[PDB]
RNA sequence: GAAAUUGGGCGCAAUAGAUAUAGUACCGCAAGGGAAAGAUGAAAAAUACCAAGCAUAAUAUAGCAAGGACUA
């Protein structure tokens, strides 16, 4: 063990590069898709 | 295909029922063809919720548009 040590375009590129994903999931989506979403989904465990 | 002979409504109710509110409007030189549509209430001397289409609310990679799903 080691001891404990003590704008839309550029913002979407910055998030892509930060979280190692592509750009597409940072663009929004329309109302038809925002309102189909279940905001009170079933929980378990 | 003979003859003798024998002896009111388990209706329609405005695309229905009349073409019919009218043989008018309209069309045709003419004969002739030929429509559509209305809905308050006792009194007008009392002025809701439902088709398609839209709007509230445009859109986000991929595709008979869904289905299996899924925390989404
Ligand atoms: Mg008639
Ligand atoms: Mg509708
Ligand atoms: Mg696919």
From Swiss-Prot:
Subunit (UniProt): Component of the mitochondrial large ribosomal subunit (mt-LSU). Mature mammalian 55S mitochondrial ribosomes consist of a small (28S) and a large (39S) subunit. The 28S small subunit contains a 12S ribosomal RNA (12S mt-rRNA) and 30 different proteins. The 39S large subunit contains a 16S rRNA (16S mt-rRNA), a copy of mitochondrial valine transfer RNA (mt-tRNA(Val)), which plays an integral structural role, and 52 different proteins.
Species this protein is from: Homo sapiens (Human)
The protein's name in its UniProt record: Large ribosomal subunit protein mL42
Residues of the full protein shown: 72 to 142 of 142
Record family assignment: Belongs to the mitochondrion-specific ribosomal protein mL42 family.
UniProt-annotated location(s): Mitochondrion
């Amino acid at each position: 063990t080691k001891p404990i040590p003590r704008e839309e375009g550029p913002m979407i590129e910055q998030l892509s590069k930060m979280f190692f994903t592509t750009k597409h999931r940072w663009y929004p989506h329309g109302r038809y898709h925002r309102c189909r979403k279940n905001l009170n989904p079933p929980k378990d465990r």
